[PDB]
Design a protein around this ligand. Sequence first.
Ligand SMILES: O=C1CC[C@]2(CC(c3ccccc3Cl)=NO2)C(=O)N1
Ligand code: NA
Ligand SMILES: [Zn+2]
Length: 105
Amino acid sequence: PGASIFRCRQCGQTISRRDWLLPGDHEHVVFNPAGMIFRVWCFSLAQGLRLIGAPSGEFSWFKGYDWTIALCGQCGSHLGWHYEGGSQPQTFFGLIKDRLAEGPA
Ligand SMILES: O=C1CC[C@]2(CC(c3ccccc3Cl)=NO2)C(=O)N1
Ligand code: NA
Ligand SMILES: [Zn+2]
């Protein structure tokens, strides 16, 4: 379509694909302890990120998963989190939908 690739909204960095969305919903609405609301889309796969630090289970929105902050590898924009250490699946990405731009391949 014109809606197959997700890029960083701020710089255009290639991040993910609609094909790589992971449900039983791809969309999750969550709050951090600073009360910031995020509309998170779960992806099986993403690229062009920089994962910062080591995983933490603190305040994890997803039972059994530890998170690392995922920046845009290009521009440093906070795009979401990489989740690991869980089961079925072991890992995935939670990306902030409004920080991405959807478009053609
Ligand atoms: O799964 C998640 C990932 C991101 C996180 C954890 C978090 C945080 C962690 C330690 C100290 C202060 C904060 Cl503000 N903020 O957003 C969250 O709430 N849940
Ligand atoms: Na690249
Ligand atoms: Zn960017």
